[PDB]
Amino acid sequence: REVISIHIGQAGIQVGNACWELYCLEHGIQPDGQMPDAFNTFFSETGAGKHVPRCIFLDLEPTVVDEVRTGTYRQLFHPEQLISGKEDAANNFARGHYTIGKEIVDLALDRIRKLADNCTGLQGFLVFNAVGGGTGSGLGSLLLERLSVDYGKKSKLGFTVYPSPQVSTAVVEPYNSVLSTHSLLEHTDVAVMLDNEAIYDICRRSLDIERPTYTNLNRLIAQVISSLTASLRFDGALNVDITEFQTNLVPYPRIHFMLSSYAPIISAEKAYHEQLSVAEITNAAFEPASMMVKCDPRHGKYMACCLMYRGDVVPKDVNASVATIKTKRTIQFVDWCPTGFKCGINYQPPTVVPGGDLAKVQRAVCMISNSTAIGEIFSRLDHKFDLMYAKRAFVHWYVGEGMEEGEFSEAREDLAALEKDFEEVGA
Amino acid sequence: REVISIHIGQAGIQVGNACWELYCLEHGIQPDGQMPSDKTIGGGDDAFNTFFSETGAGKHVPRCIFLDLEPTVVDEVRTGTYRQLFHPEQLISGKEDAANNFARGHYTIGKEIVDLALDRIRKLADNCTGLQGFLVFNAVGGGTGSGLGSLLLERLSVDYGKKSKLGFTVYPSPQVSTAVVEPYNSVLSTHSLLEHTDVAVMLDNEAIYDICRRSLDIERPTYTNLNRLIAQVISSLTASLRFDGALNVDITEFQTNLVPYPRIHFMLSSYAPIISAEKAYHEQLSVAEITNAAFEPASMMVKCDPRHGKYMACCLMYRGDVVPKDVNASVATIKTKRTIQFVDWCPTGFKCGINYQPPTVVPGGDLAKVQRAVCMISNSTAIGEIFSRLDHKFDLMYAKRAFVHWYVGEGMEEGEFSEAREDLAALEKDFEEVGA
Amino acid sequence: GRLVAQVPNEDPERLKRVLDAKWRTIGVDKETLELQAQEKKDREQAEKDRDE
Amino acid sequence: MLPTDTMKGTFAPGTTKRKTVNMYDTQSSTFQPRPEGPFEAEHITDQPA
Amino acid sequence: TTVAGGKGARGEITRRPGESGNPYGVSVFVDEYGKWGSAIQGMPLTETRARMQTKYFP
Amino acid sequence: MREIVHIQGGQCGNQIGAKFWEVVSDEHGIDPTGTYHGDSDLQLERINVYFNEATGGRYVPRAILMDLEPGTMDSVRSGPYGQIFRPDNFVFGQTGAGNNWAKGHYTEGAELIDSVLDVVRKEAESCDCLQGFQVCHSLGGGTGSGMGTLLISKIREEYPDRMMLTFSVVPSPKVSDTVVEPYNATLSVHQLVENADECMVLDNEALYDICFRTLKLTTPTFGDLNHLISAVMSGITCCLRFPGQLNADLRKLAVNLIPFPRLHFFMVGFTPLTSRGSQQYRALTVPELTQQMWDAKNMMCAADPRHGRYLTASALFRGRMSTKEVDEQMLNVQNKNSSYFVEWIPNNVKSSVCDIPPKGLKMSATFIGNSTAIQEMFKRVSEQFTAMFRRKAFLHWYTGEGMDEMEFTEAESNMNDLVSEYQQYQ
Amino acid sequence: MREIVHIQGGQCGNQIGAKFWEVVSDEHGIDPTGTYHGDSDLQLERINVYFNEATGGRYVPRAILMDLEPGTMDSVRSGPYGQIFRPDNFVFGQTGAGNNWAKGHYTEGAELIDSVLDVVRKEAESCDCLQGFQVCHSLGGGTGSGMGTLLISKIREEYPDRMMLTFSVVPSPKVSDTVVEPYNATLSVHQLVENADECMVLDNEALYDICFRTLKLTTPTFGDLNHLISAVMSGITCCLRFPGQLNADLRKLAVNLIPFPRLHFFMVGFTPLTSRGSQQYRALTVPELTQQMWDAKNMMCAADPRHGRYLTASALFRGRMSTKEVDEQMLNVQNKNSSYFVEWIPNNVKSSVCDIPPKGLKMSATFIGNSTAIQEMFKRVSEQFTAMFRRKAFLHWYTGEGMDEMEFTEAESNMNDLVSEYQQYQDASAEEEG
């Protein structure tokens, strides 16, 4: 029941830094690599009294990779895991896809094969990358293409990060987003959307942190991934595997873009006065103010909904809460899907980390849905891309790296076809 | 059984501050949130289910929200004695106030604060299971209470509708006041108050001042005593839901037995005995004299004279050592008295409610421990007199168009003033017609 | 469970904590909450100390 | 009368790794019945006693 | 003896495992748990918090 | 053997039934824990009518508790003899009617009557041979008047040939609790006249007067009135539960009190009723009981029989007595004030004797008299109804539930016809 | 002699089988470690129907377990009475269907059902007079519904004359766990209507309602529901294992309950089921057993028989009774409620008596109702199916593995003709022929 995670770019490996710290603290593995069988899906019993994470951290720039190498977890990671190039893609999809990407792609794929060889019950892959940059967008695209042609139907979960609409950190990022989504549409099995301003709002509102850094965002992402993979790791009353998500959450092969939500996100003090139970945190997992992508599901229809429960949770109260939600009319399900809910319960309560902001919570919910607000997200990105492409701005860089303007167009009509598909499905 | 109280406006916040202190003292909850360690579980507990929910371990959060546009009073609450009692997200606070302007708080500022209050109320009601009905506290003289209070009433009626909404407002006093533009606020709030509030009870400050000066012989009273008296009335009218009685009356009975017409819901209020710690010992308190004491205009909480009107309906609250025989005798003696006349329509014009728990006392207050008390809530046509009195002086200052430029600038027009004018005139005519 | 099974079907701790319905409805770890609160207070103390 | 009072049965560990080690290894933990152990009461020296 | 009528003072029927006044304790049957004001009748609340997972009920 | 099923509606119905079951359980000698601890074998031979043997001397009452609020059931289980009722028999609404005939007759009764009907059907088929049904409720409240009348309709349409008693408390103008008393009372009476087999009229004004003059009590709470009502209810059914020299069941009393099917409204009285201070200064003789039984001030209704004619009457006696004095006293009281009895019905008085008196007594009686003065209260209520309805006062709280103005007009017309025929037979 | 084999499929089937084997092991007096330590000789005479004697009073259950993921088998082993099951009877794969009927019916079932057939055939030939097969599984999951139905088809193809019971839980709308429940359920029913000898429809709606209303339990977990199902199965099998005044084997019930071969869907209930705080108030007599037996709220399907007619009925009785009282209660219930019984069959009710009650009781009852109101569930599932199937929803998970739309159309058509046949037999004219 092993799963290997690939981290592409700076953001991917920072998310991995949070995730692996959480994993090591959760299974009792010390940073040196020794415990003082649930660990089998992330760690491997190597030699005697040693565990090595099943992960490859790949980036084209050394700064962050050897910062990870020099940190506390020197011994935990095998030295051959942390792949590092010599020069950066420099926010250039074409550069990281044709120029520097080709050189480092072969080494990563051979390492992936060795991890897969040990993996006897490999459930699937799950990726981390940010499409705004060059390495996470350019090299990630080629890596997914060759990983798919190597395996074909193996599950590759996408925990990607699209640029946020109003706030962003670059100028050339719409081009990278479009040229990466053209392949993320057809090569990713399940994609989980993750926006930055939404997590900023979540931290400002719920965790009342007025000055949040990327560390809190990565910690929340790690909490989501842990609550998602606890069914693989720890036993519950009613667990679900990776194939469950594809089977019960993907109505059509071209529609895999999942909104993420988690509850309860609470501080230590506000945990004193809120009656923390199962029903109201399920209610809090459906409001747009507690979603990880700034989109309004009120504008769309739910094709399906998934629910992950952890802690002291029984089927009775989750069934009651699902019935209560189905009786509500604030959110509406699509007509062709009359049973758009799927529940899952795990015994293991969520863990806490020293220095973290989340309180010790005895029951938590991780929500993964599928609505059509992603449709307006795509069009909102497309309008900004088309504004830039009308004057042929920054195109000369990509043309110089080796690609031509035909890719830009074909990606534009690919997005247009996707918009039409999402509009037709919601009817 | 649950009831959640929303307090809108600075006056609403102070009234809620008195009410929740009285509630915590009445159920034995310490100001820090948890009941004392020496408490022993037994019969009589769990009564706080309709006001406090149990969270975490040993913590009771009130089923309430304070909402205001100016943060001074909310911050004083957040810093005062009951710091740990209220959930921080419950006390909604704005960034700028409406500044005695119905238009500003109804169209400019209230639009961005109404959504948060409704979002909190939705989850508060979802926590509840046997919600009886809402009740709102506000002062129509001010801006936040009147301006966006109408918006909250609008959206509460839209969201639920059939659930009860008790509107215990604070109208400006006829001769004494604190502001200038309060007639516009009162008229524009009343226009939206007719078709949304199921039952309304008038609260005037001058009447409570007279009650305190005359009966409680406090010659320098502040708002604290007025709020304490309002809280005592609220507790006396919610104790039937809370504690067991020989014959108890619910919040749903008020509409059935006091509202003869859908547009006529304006209830006068009285309370007795309002006695200090010195007069209480000397005079023997019995139901006859306290019932007779809830009938003179000098013991009413709104500056009006029911002698000029006709008692359409009456409701009687009893707490303490009350047996039905003597209350039946008292109501018979009232019915046979001719200094007050009942309307032709309601020959059985009384509804009595008896509860066992006597009213509680609060340290720092003025009333002493009493064996029995009566809370009076009746309906008459003197409300048609106070509304006409407010009519005359609203028209008087609207004739020359004073302060109107403020409302025009906020985004209103002159049409809404006229439609509120006509609605108030129609309500006046209905009040004089029903009494015929 | 569907994939893994570590805790048995009648764990005394699990059965005790699930049978007490109050714990399922509400449950806290007050000491740890106080520890987190003091950790937060120490972090703003250290931040303003660096500024000083 | 909690139902756990009448709960009878012998329990076994759930899923685990393959043993990969035999009992003949010195590092392999084994159950040694002897020495006899803490007998209770007096004159319980010999077994038919 | 006079019997108080109407509603208020939640009794042996309204009381449920999950509400805002009921104590801790392991209960298998609702009606057995529905009578704690008659069974306990005088223990301090701190003791009920102390005896966390224990029967101490009819 | 012959079985009686108890039905309670509303707050007043629940309290009256609680006191009634207390006194009945006392009569048959079962303890508040539900176990038999009597002495004589006579107490054990006729307990099937009101109790079902569960296990080891455990007997549960044959009653249904039904209303729309938790607190009444909580109080029923809080008081003494609250642990003898079977929890399954507490059929139970959740929202409340609250002094609204329409709410308890069309909206709230609709989804609750199915469970009440299921429970009463289960409990009726539990025993072999039903004798009749028994109902205690109010004509002024919401969940007692409307829901009770709808239950009456359903159970009459379900079990047509069985008997039925109705002990209904009617509001009095002197003691008025709610505002909507006439609106509920008129429609409840409209249903009752066309569906109920026979009705016993009760009101709190008469009971307060009785506890004032006769019992001489300072604080006559609802406990004393409920005690009087429970004593009357036990007295009516005494012959079925114990042997006697001349027995009389429900049907035997009904046939001797109802010459016309629409005249089934009786005014009731109980005897003896004397204060404890004056308890030793009196003798226990049949004339001393029949002088108080026929007294107008001893009756439990606000309708003076001296303003009308005793159309029929019935008396049920308890205790080892002489039938000679019973017959002589009835004949003498019939002959003396011959102006108060109707002309075309000779021998207006029906009598029955049981030899088992209630606990603490050796001589007791119960009066059920069909008089034509019972329409005085109907006129007194109809005049208030006409005064209020005449320009649609409080109407919106009834029309908005689906009701129409015709329900008021038809109810008024039928009540007027009832009082007209009652005055005609005078 | 008479032999019954138990087959468990999927997670739900495995848990139900665990509870059933626990209660049966308790009933027959064997300890959790597998040896006999009972008291009476009645516990030895008829244990061959469920156990094989190995060595020194060791009796191994005659069961075959099934799944596709190790968690269920490990949970079965680790629980109490987990050391009685033979490790060779754990025919098993380790990939997982994943809530997919097609995966458990064509891709994964095709290679594992051969090992299942080996195990079950070695078992079925390990006995002298096989009475019938007994299968418990789900219709919402993938490894229990699809692979279970394929095993049912294969067994019916190999052994045609033997009996076959199916305790199958069906999805219901008030509690819907997964999304593809109608797709699995429709095709599973399409298979059962042609392969299964008789079916007993279960669902968690009625189990939860029974626990909430009748038992009044605070927290009705799956343990209580599995216990109820296990008690139902034990009361079904009781006649074979213990002497009585009137015996009724599974074949006798099938021939007394099935008037036409496609009408083999039964609704079941158990009696008595009362709260511990309320067991003091109630009388304990045979009429109390029968009255709660016939109650609609005691039934274990979300289908009220009041909405239809009783075609036939059966009641299973345990404990020493008088046949007079049973017969008169049946006659009374059959004659009073005259409109709820079909007319072209007089004496719709079959009865039998056993002398041994279940643990903790002295008398009990089990009711089987072949009603025409069961097609309410089939319509209630078919509406969701035809709403979802209208625009090919989730279809690529089935057509992308070998299936075509024609299978879905055939399943829908078969379900529709089944409900139409039930409806016509409900309102069939009483006294005519053509």
Ligand SMILES: Nc1nc2c(ncn2[C@@H]2O[C@H](COP(=O)(O)OP(=O)(O)OP(=O)(O)O)[C@@H](O)[C@H]2O)c(=O)[nH]1
């Ligand atoms: N959520 C989240 N997003 C991040 C984080 N770090 C970087 N990003 C996103 O990544 C985008 C730019 O890519 P980077 O991750 O900084 O680096 P890169 O993808 O390797 O691209 P290069 O700079 O060319 O190497 C920014 O627009 C951010 O939105 C992070 O820690 N958390």
Ligand SMILES: Nc1nc2c(ncn2[C@@H]2O[C@H](COP(=O)(O)OP(=O)(O)OP(=O)(O)O)[C@@H](O)[C@H]2O)c(=O)[nH]1
């Ligand atoms: N009875 C009573 N009335 C009060 C109290 N405090 C304020 N008021 C009334 O409130 C009115 C003015 O409104 P404020 O309470 O000051 O504040 P507001 O209602 O939010 O209106 P703005 O100040 O314009 O935002 C005055 O005319 C008073 O009559 C109080 O403690 N008791």
Ligand SMILES: Nc1nc2c(ncn2[C@@H]2O[C@H](COP(=O)(O)OP(=O)(O)O)[C@@H](O)[C@H]2O)c(=O)[nH]1
């Ligand atoms: N005798 C008697 N009368 C009662 C009792 N409880 C209430 N009442 C009378 O019933 C009337 C109110 O009925 P109500 O409780 O509203 O009926 P409900 O709404 O159907 O429950 C009042 O006039 C009371 O005088 C009681 O216990 N005994």
Ligand SMILES: Nc1nc2c(ncn2[C@@H]2O[C@H](COP(=O)(O)OP(=O)(O)O)[C@@H](O)[C@H]2O)c(=O)[nH]1
């Ligand atoms: N009665 C009962 N139902 C169960 C149990 N376990 C699971 N279920 C139900 O079965 C459905 C899921 O079936 P699943 O376990 O996936 O079947 P499988 O894939 O064949 O193992 C859910 O709707 C549950 O409600 C159980 O132990 N008892």
Ligand SMILES: [Mg+2]
């Ligand atoms: Mg970078």
Ligand SMILES: [Mg+2]
């Ligand atoms: Mg203000």
